[PDB]
Amino acid sequence: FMLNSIRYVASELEDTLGGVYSILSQELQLPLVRVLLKQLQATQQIPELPKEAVEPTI
Amino acid sequence: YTHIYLDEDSGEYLRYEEVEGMEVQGSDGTYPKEACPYIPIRMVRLDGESYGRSYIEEYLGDLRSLENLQE
Amino acid sequence: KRTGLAEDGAKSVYERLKNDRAPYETRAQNCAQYTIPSLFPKDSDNASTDYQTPWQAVGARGLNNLAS
Amino acid sequence: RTGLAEDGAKSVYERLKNDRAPYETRAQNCAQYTIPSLFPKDSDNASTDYQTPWQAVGARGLNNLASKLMLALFPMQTWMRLTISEYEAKQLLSDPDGLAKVDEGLSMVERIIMNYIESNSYRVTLFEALKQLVVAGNVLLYLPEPEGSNYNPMKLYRLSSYVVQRDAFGNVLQMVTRDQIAFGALPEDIRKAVEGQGGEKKADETIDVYTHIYLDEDSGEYLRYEEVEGMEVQGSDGTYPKEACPYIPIRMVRLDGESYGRSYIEEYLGDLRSLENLQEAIVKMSMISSKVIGLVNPAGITQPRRLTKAQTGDFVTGRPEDISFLQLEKQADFTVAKAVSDAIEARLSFAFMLNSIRYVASELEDTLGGVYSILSQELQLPLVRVLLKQLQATQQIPELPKEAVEPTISTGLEAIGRGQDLDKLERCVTAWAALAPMRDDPDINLAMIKLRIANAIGIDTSGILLTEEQKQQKMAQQS
Structure with missing residues (x-):
């Protein structure tokens, strides 16, 4: 449970111990960033004029 | 009750709200297959199973034994 | 008027699928009981209920610690 | 189809599943002794509780092994290098500035590969594949053809979903992948195909789709098609070269003859068995110890009723010696069991790197099991050989050098950080920084010393250092 332990508490600590925390980075983070976008984009809170690419989210 | 499902044809998710028997005409939103604002989550994904398998699920035996000893 | 997966109705599909959700609820209840029990109480559980500490x-x- | 495909995808998959059984059983045992939920059995489904080891x-x-290998094989820093094979491009090149521009273009291609890998969430799938490899070394990673910019992560195929056929050399490949996609979500072509083959399919019932690729009986490449029910789908008729096949079967430990398998923890399965047996025995002895029983000697005078029916204090008739409690006398056996368990745990930890970038690879991670160099030819190169060609098929990394083939040398240890070129360059530049006080030293020739130390370092100074002709023409131009 990591009782006997940003970037060191992540890609390490909460990685070698905890199996995969990257499944919550593709199941919780990306989906939220992809809904916040297109929602803030349907409303006039972020610019909407890519016309170059689709600007992927990592 | 809010129910969203795949379009039987080559379509996107169809969303509607049912309160009591009949739906509400006001709620007829349709969302793309990509930007679905409901976002079901799963911690440990297993093929076949629709969801579940918490992290503490596979340490439940240790908790059982430790709690028995401490009791 | 609704097409496939929705002709019967939201209530009916929810009732049908709740039976397939039972094992996950039971395992979640067990995990909660052995950890902090108040997190995932049973459906019947309500006020006036005491959550015995593990x-x-x-x-x-x-x-x-994991959540934090 | 004919040539390894006349019978059909379903029939060949069923035939080859019998040769997959031993690997599945060993994988299931390994999963059971490690985290059991990782590799569930086919019969195993929801409502099943995985008794923790x-x-x-x-x-x-x-x-630990999965995380370490993922921090070694696929790190944050570029893990593949595009080489140029100097002296093959020099002959058809104007001045070393051209070579530097070619290297810059290769670096840009590497950066774009980084961008594509990170944008499609390849890291999660790679980590899952790596963990599956450690528990049961085998995974098939299908890379769909890019379509626009929408992310298309590789669809990982566990052992239970695919089969492979290999000869002694492994040259012969016949890979069949089974995927259960329910009608209503079936790709349009497959949806119409299944509807045509039969009548109406319920949106809930699962539909089995088989994708089979095989060597062309003649001097041909791999032939790919998708079969849903008896007859294939006219839409799926792709043909792939034997080099750039987007399915990329993986194996952790390769043994000649065997088509795949031999997970890493297979050889340590006996130690896991012994440790689990010892720990089970110890835990059960502890549970025995937990129970408390009051042994009262019949020959005594103490009566437990007056003991129970008494508050704190409340002097009672009796003798302490009469009341005794059962105890687990098995102590020395406990000590020897603990010693053996500690020894087994220590050896396993040394084997799993628990008792431990380049120090996370070369040393540690490539010394506690040499699999960082066998999985750099099975997972790293095949992925960069398929990712580059697809991204060339679309207009994302246009290549038109006409000089070399720009070979990929992923080989992490070889090119972890773009190779040891920055170190050589900084060392030679620092050395050239010295000798400045002795410029007014007519006895020595600065250029000779500089070139000699550059040769000693082995670095290439075709353009960095101006030769006699270059110096003379520069002086003439300056005038």
């Missing part, structure tokens, strides 16, 4: 008391700390 | 060290080691 003896081990390491599950609660581990859950809190 | 007693030893609880195989799971730790599995997680």
Whole structure:
């Protein structure tokens, strides 16, 4: 449970111990960033004029 | 009750709200297959199973034994 | 008027699928009971219910630490 | 189809599933002794409880190995290098500035590969594949053809979903992948195909789709098609070269003859068995110890009724010796069991790197099991050989050098950080920084010394250092 332990508490600590925390980075983070976008984009809170690419989210 | 499902044809998710028997005409939103604002989550994904398998699920035996000893 | 997967109705599909959700609810209830029990109470559980604290008391700390 | 395909995808998959059984059984055993939920059985489904292992060290080691290999094979820094094979492009090149521009273009291609890998969430799928490899070394990673910019992560195929056929050399490949996609979500072509083959399919019932690729009986490449029910789908008729096949079967430990398998923890399965048995015995002895029984001697005078029906204090008639409690006398056996368990845990931890970038590879991670160099030819290169060609098929990394083939040398250890070129360049530049006080030293020739030390370092100074002709023409131009 990591009782006997940003970037060191992540890609390490909460990685070698905890199996995969990257499944919550593709199941919780990306989906939220992809809904916040297109929602803030349907409303006039972020610019909407890519016309170059689709600007992927990592 | 809010129910969203795949379009039987080559379509996107169809969303509607049912309160009591009949739906509400006001709620007829349709969302793309990509930007679905409901976002079901799963911690440990297993093929076949629709969801579940918490992290503490596979340490439940240790908790059982430790709690028995401490009791 | 609704097409496939929705002709019967939201209530009916929810009732049908709730039976397939039972094992996950039971395992979640067990995990909650051995860790902090108040997190995932049973459907019947309501006010006037006392959540006996686990003896081990390491599950609660581990859950809190993982969440943090 | 004919030539390894006349019978059909379903028939060949069923035939080859019998040769997959031993690997599945060994994988299931390894999963059971480590985290059991990782590799569930086919019969196993929801409503099944995975009894957690007693030893609880195989799971730790599995997680550590997966994380370490993922931090070594696929790191944050570029893990592949595009080489140019100098002296093959020099002959058809104007001045070393051209070579530097070619290297810059290769670096840009590497950066774009980084961008594509990170944008499609390849890291999660790679980590899952790596963990599956450690528990049961075999995974098939299908890379769909890019379509626009929408992310298309590789669809990981566990052992239970695919089969492979290999000859002694492994040259012969016949890979069949089974995927259960329910009608209503079936790709349009497959949806119409299944509807045409039969009548109406319920949106809930699962539909089995088989994708089979085989060597062309003649001097041909791999032939790919998708079969849903008896007859294939006219839409799927792709043909792929034997080099750039987007399915990329993986194996952790290769043994000649065997088509695949031999997970890493297979050889340590006996130690896991012994540790689990010892830990189970210890836990059960502890549970025995937990129970408390009051042994009262009949020959005594103490009566437990007056003991129970008495508050704190409340002097009672009796003798302390009469009341005794049962105890687990098995102590020395406990000590020897603990010693053996500690020894087994220590050896396993050394084997799983629990008792431990380049120090996370070369040393540690490539010394506690040499699999960082066998999985750099099975997972790293095949992925960069398919990712580059697809991204060339679309207009994302246009290549038109006409000089070399720009070979990929992923080979992490070889090119972890773009190779040891920055170190050589900084060392030679620092050396050239010296000798400045002795410029007014007519006895020595600065250029000779500089070139000699550059040769000693082995670095290429075709353009960095101006030769006699270059110096003379520069002086003439300056005038």
